[PDB]
């Protein structure tokens, strides 16, 4: 299990420890640079928009356009260090895409890691949201919105067909990769209760390389597709890649249950968002119901 964030009070500040390090964080930070898109959505949900001073405008999705005029600190992968240091932030919030920059970010300001644990999603989620809320004295408000997400998950779980099984795939250029329980798309199986076609696909951020023959051999009832081409701006599109005779023979193809999930939520990985996680839950739910 990834280590949780832990905090202790010290008057004007908290001493915070997370899986990457220790940081003294001031209470009520007022210049926050946010590189995790989910947490950025949680700032919105908690009415903390005016605290944010930097965002990754190169990867800002459609549901986060209230932050389009914030100063840009680049993208989720192409972090602009000069821009960040010019802002003089009091806090920088990252997730797993930026852990490789942690030392460099920590020289600028205290840097909090809000990674989602792929093997312990819901527990991680709650700890990331509550830790942020504690910085601002908003635990109460955050608890109430967490309780809303939990109720949405119960509604989604309750309509799931225990007989039926699903395969999760990612399309990049023209190649296909598969993901299963405890991967970066694990919540489909782990939280929402959808049975997997193969429990033995045991993967993290990088998927198991397969072809359509595999998909047909497994004959899933649902295929959930995340198209990485949309995010990277490639020409290739999963609808094209999956239009072939082998995929056409699956029960998923025959029942219109090939589901193209929005990659601005699933791939860009906005699960730390109090509203964005809800939208993703509903998207699974309305696809299956
Ligand atoms: O460290 C990571 N990738 C290494 C670099 C790959 C280099 C190429 N990537 C892109 O152009 C890109 C752009 C936006 C979002 C992304 O996730 C991207 O991978 C990484 C970590 C967790 C999840 C990911 O998904 C990652 O990638
Ligand atoms: Fe990536």
**Would you tell me which CATH number, out of the four given (3.40.50.10950, 3.40.50.1980, 3.40.50.300, 3.20.20.140), belongs to the domain 1-159+262-289?**
3.40.50.1980
59 lines ligand 1 (CB under 6 A): yes
Residue 91 contacts by C-beta under 8 Å, 6 or more apart in sequence? 25, 26, 29, 31, 32, 33, 109, 110, 111, 112, 135
Q: Where in the chain is the domain with CATH 3.40.50.1980?
A: 1-159+262-289, 160-261
Ligand 1, atom nearest to 205 Cα: 23
Superfamily in which the 160-261 domain is placed by CATH: Nitrogenase molybdenum iron protein domain (3.40.50.1980)
230 lines ligand 1 (CB under 6 A): no
Burial class (CB in 10 A: 0-12, 13-18, 19+), 80: middle
- Helical spans, DSSP H, in 109-250: 121-135, 139-157, 187-190, 212-218, 228-232, 238-242, 245-248
Ligand 1, atom nearest to 184 Cα: 23
Resolution for this experimental structure (Å): 1.9
Nearest CA, atom 7, ligand 1: 77
278 lines ligand 1 (CB under 6 A): no
CA angle (183 as vertex; 178, 186 as ends), nearest 5: 95
77 lines ligand 1 (CB under 6 A): yes
> Which tokens hold the place of 182?
């405890």
Cβ atoms within 10 A of the Cβ of 213, count? 10
Method of determination used here: X-ray
Q: 3-state class of 13 per DSSP?
A: strand
Q: Is the dihedral of CA 78, 84, 85, 89 positive or negative?
A: negative
Query: 37 CA to middle of ligand 1, Å?
Result: 14
Nearest CA, atom 22, ligand 1: 97
Q: Tell which phi-psi region holds residue 28, choosing left (phi > 0), alpha (psi between -120 and 50) or beta.
A: left
Query: 208 CA to middle of ligand 1, Å?
Result: 17
Nearest alpha-carbon partner for 242 in 250, 230, 234: 250
| Integer Cα distance of 4 and 200 in angstroms | 27
Ligand 1, atom nearest to 97 Cα: 21
Across the chain, which distance is largest between two alpha carbons, in Å? 65
Give, as one character, the DSSP assignment of residue 195.
E
- Ligand number with the minimum distance to the CA of 268: 1
| Integer Cα distance of 180 and 192 in angstroms | 13
* Stretch (H or E) spanning 287: helix 276-287
* Stretch (H or E) spanning 279: helix 276-287
- Helical spans, DSSP H, in 158-273: 187-190, 212-218, 228-232, 238-242, 245-248, 251-254, 263-266
Beta-strand runs (E) in 41-109: 52-54, 91-94
């Amino acid at each position: 299990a990834m280590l949780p964030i832990s905090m202790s009070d010290e008057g004007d500040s908290f001493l915070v420890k997370d899986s990457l390090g220790e940081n003294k964080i001031p209470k009520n930070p007022s210049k926050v640079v946010i590189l995790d898109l989910g947490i950025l959505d949680t700032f919105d949900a908690l009415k903390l928009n005016d605290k944010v001073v930097g965002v990754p405008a190169k990867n800002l999705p459609k549901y986060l356009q209230q932050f389009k005029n914030k100063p840009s600190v680049g993208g989720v992968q192409q972090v602009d260090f000069e821009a960040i240091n010019a802002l003089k932030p009091d806090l920088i919030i990252i997730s797993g895409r930026q852990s490789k920059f942690y030392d460099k970010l920590k020289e600028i300001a205290p840097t909090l890691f809000v990674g989602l644990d792929n093997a312990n999603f819901l527990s991680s989620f709650e700890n990331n949201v509550l830790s942020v809320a504690k910085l601002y004295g908003l635990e109460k408000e955050a608890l109430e919105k967490i309780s809303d997400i939990k109720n949405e998950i119960e509604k989604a779980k309750s309509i799931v067909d225990e007989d039926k099984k699903a395969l999760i795939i990612l399309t990049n250029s023209n190649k296909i990769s598969a993901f299963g329980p405890q991967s970066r798309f694990g919540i489909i199986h782990d939280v929402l209760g959808i049975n997997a076609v193969d429990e033995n696909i045991k993967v993290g951020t990088l998927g198991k390389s397969i072809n359509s023959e595999f998909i047909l051999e497994k004959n899933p009832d649902y295929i959930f597709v995340v198209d990485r081409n949309v995010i990277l701006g490639n020409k290739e599109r999963a609808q094209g890649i999956l239009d072939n005779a082998l995929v056409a023979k699956t029960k998923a193809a025959q029942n219109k249950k090939i589901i193209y999930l929005d990659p601005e939520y699933w791939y860009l990985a906005s699960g730390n968002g109090l509203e964005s996680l809800k939208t993703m839950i509903l998207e699974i739910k309305n696809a299956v119901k």
